[PDB]
Each structure stands twice: as C-alpha cells, then as structure tokens.
Ligand binder design. Structure first.
Ligand code: CU1
Length: 99
C-alpha cells in the first residue's frame, strides 16, 4: 500500500493516516509535498515484541525530494503508530493496523 508524506495541499499529514494491512504487505511511504519528512515507529505504541529500530528511518535521515520512498513490511499483528520526526509535534502521525 502507498502512503503519501505530505498532502498535495501542503498539509503535514500521512495520506492515508490510518489504514489496515495484512501482516507482511509492503508499505511504501512515498515522499509527496512539503518536505522534509521521514518515517519512524513509536516504541511506546507498537505490538509487544516489535523492535522499532528495524522498521524506522534513522532520525537524522530526511526525504527532501518528491518520489523518494521508505519501504517496510510488518509481520506482527496489532496496532502501530508511526510519525514524521520533523512534524510529529504538528500532528503528522498515523496508525497502521496489521491483521
Ligand atoms: Cu513530515
């Protein structure tokens, strides 16, 4: 499934910001508008057993150009919160439910 980083209208949002996916589907976060963005998972809001370091960009790594992607495939079922490091204080966060 593709998830846009920034809305076409400049909103600091993941698009979509909440979605469900079967375990192991590749999620392609795709840089879209209003950079820089990145993608990290919140160590306090993922299923027990999940190591966020493996499914997160490094905080220092930013996507500054349209069409760059960060791709992950989540195998453990449950809810995961992911966020943009630059924009997480501006509500750029989202929830994927792996079922
Ligand atoms: Cu962002």
């Amino acid at each position: 499934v593709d998830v846009l980083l920034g809305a076409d209208d400049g909103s600091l949002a993941f698009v979509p910001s909440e979605f469900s996916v079967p375990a192991g589907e590749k999620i392609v976060f795709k840089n879209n508008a209003g950079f820089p963005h990145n993608v990290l998972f919140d160590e306090d809001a993922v299923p027990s057993g999940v190591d966020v370091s493996k499914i997160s960009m490094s905080e220092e790594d930013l996507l500054n150009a349209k069409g760059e992607t960060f791709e992950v495939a989540l195998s453990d079922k449950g809810e995961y919160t992911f966020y943009c490091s630059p924009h997480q204080g501006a509500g750029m966060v989202g929830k994927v439910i792996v079922n």
